[PDB]
Design a protein around this nucleic acid. Structure first.
Ligand SMILES: [Zn+2]
Length: 601
DNA sequence: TTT
């Protein structure tokens, strides 16, 4: 166990300056801020920890204020002495999720530079699916060392202490150990990270630079109108009441809108085919099947849809408004997805209905501040463009090249008719095929998504591959090397290890092969999106225009732009995104603006 | 992910 003998507690300036001096000449050093809250914008710095060498670490408490806390260097004094080191881009720091720490220092007007290594990201890039990338997991997996957990020194549940309440020495064991271990983790992973140029390229030029940019995005937050959401909520309550009646009115008596219990004894008991509908879900939905004619399942279907939306966004969002900023600050997770795409939580921006009227009403709540407008810059069907590239298909590429709708272009080729005549059903069919390929779906699954018989769908796929051969090759070639080397790469070098690529298991291995085909396109989209964020943020930081990047969701970047700078800014954002990222994939950036996110979306 |  870690005792009080392992690390020093710095309580005097002289000792701090001595450490600063050593830190200044160290090649790299681990750094971490201790605070009184997870909420970055409102958190107060409570202490700082540093590790200069394995086994050599210190904790500097500055704002522990429990009853009779011993004297500590003051926060302002510690920070003024540390500021130079922290803002020196030449002083390289190592840390665990430095995005957090960068933000905390930003509450004090300090701009952390030299953000060179993040062990969370080192781990993530080495093998995204190896397991969780939190430090407790990393310490165990890479060093067979069990770190003191936050719950171990602070407690659990509502009665969990905030770090400033923890005794100086106990706080030190926890924080200094974290610093020491972070440096050790770095010393083990960094050498590994260079066994391959692809992962190294992604780590160095994409993930690390993105660290401060995500901090800025999160800290900027988004402006949401609580009234709009509340009115939406009141309304949904009403509609839910109306819908519950129309359900009672279509049938007899009352009942819960829970199928396989009350519904099955209604819907089919009043004729229909016995199978219900799993809310398994996005492949088998008999409720909406019947919905095309049977009125009850259609209302049950919408009832649930609004119920989920209301309790997830309409009633939640307003409560996420931060009292200190009056804005909402989503949590971006940079090391969680298997493919490399950023994920978002509280709120989860990506689960807000795109093609739905209610989803749009939610986005109407994301408003621009006075004299500003919301600007949306989206990469039009980037993953389809990436496949065209990865497939080297002159046909798909040409379609994009002449600005034609690729779904109608594809239909014209598969069904063999003039582009102008392609019907909605045919476009819908080519669309299902195209997106089916990205997820590497089978002819049978496609049949289930287009409601056509098996082999009929296979008939369509054979025609597709015949008209677009380069796609089948890519797929065969990608499933191939996947088994050859156990992983697939993105254009930049990002890797997705596929352990079950030879699982001798049924589904599990089928899943691995699908991931093999998809990852390279979805992963390349992610690298492209991150590189865009980095390029735009660099311009923002350098030119200092009147714009804030406020969100990243799916394939779009969202901003607040001063109403009088819109055109010059829209132009610049547009050029940076489709011309200052990768030059090999045919990219198209759609830019829109409006008073709210829906207007610009 | 961080405190
Ligand atoms: Zn352009």
């Amino acid at each position: 166990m870690i005792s009080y003998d392992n690390y020093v507690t710095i309580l005097d300036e002289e000792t701090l300056k001595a450490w600063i001096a050593k830190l200044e000449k160290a090649p790299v050093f681990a750094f971490a801020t201790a605070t009184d809250s997870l909420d970055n914008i409102s958190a107060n710095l409570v202490g700082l920890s540093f590790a200069i060498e394995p086994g050599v670490a210190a904790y500097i408490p500055v704002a522990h204020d429990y009853l009779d806390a011993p004297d500590q260097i003051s926060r302002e004094r510690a920070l003024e002495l540390l500021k130079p080191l922290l803002e020196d881009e030449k002083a390289l720091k190592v840390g665990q999720n430095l995005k957090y720490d960068r933000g905390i220092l930003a509450n004090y007007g300090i701009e952390l530079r030299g953000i060179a290594f993040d062990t969370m990201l080192e781990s993530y890039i080495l093998n995204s699916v190896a397991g969780r990338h939190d430090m407790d997991s990393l310490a165990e997996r890479w060093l067979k060392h069990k770190t003191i957990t936050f719950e171990e020194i602070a407690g659990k549940g509502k009665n969990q202490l905030t770090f400033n309440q923890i005794a100086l020495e106990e706080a030190g064991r926890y924080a200094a150990e974290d610093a020491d271990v972070t440096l050790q983790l770095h010393l083990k992973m960094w050498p590994d990270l260079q066994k391959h140029k692809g992962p190294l390229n992604v780590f160095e030029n994409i993930e690390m630079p993105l660290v401060p940019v995500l901090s800025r995005i999160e800290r900027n937050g988004v402006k949401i109108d609580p009234k709009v959401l509340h009115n939406h909520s009141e309304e949904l309550t009403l509609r839910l009441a109306e819908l519950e009646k129309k359900a009672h009115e279509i049938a007899g008596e009352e009942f819960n809108l829970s199928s396989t219990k009350q519904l099955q004894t209604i819907l089919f008991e009043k004729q229909g085919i016995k199978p219900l509908k799993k809310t398994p879900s996005t492949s088998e939905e008999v409720l909406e099947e019947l919905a095309l004619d049977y009125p009850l399942p259609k209302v049950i279907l919408e009832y649930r849809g609004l119920a989920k939306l209301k309790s997830t966004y309409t009633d939640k969002l307003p409560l996420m408004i931060n009292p200190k900023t009056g804005r909402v600050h989503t949590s971006y997770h940079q090391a969680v997805t298997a493919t490399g795409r950023l994920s978002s939580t509280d709120p989860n921006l990506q689960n807000i209905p795109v093609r739905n009227e209610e989803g749009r009403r939610i986005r109407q709540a994301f408003i621009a501040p006075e004299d500003y407008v919301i600007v949306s810059a989206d990469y039009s069907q980037i993953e389809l463009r990436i496949m065209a590239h990865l497939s080297r298909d002159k046909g798909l590429l040409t379609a994009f090249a002449e600005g034609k709708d690729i779904h109608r272009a594809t239909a014209a080729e598969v069904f063999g008719l003039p582009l102008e005549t392609v019907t909605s059903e045919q476009r819908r069919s080519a669309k299902a095929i195209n997106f089916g390929l990205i997820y590497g779906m089978s002819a049978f699954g496609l049949a289930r998504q287009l409601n056509i018989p098996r082999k009929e769908a296979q008939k369509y796929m054979d025609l597709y591959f015949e008209r677009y051969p380069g796609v089948l090759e890519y797929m065969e070639r990608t499933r191939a090397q996947a088994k050859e080397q156990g992983y697939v790469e993105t254009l930049d070098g990002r890797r997705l290890y596929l352990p079950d690529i030879k699982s001798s298991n049924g589904a599990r291995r089928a899943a691995a092969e699908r991931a093999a085909i998809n990852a390279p396109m979805q992963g390349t989209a992610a690298d492209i999106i991150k590189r865009a964020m980095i390029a735009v943020d660099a311009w923002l930081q350098a030119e200092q225009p009147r714009v804030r990047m406020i969100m990243q969701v799916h394939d779009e970047l969202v901003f607040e732009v001063h109403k009088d700078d819109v055109d010059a800014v829209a132009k610049q954002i547009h050029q940076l995104m489709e011309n200052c990222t990768r030059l090999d994939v045919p990219l198209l950036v759609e830019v829109g603006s409006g008073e709210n996110w829906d207007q610009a979306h």
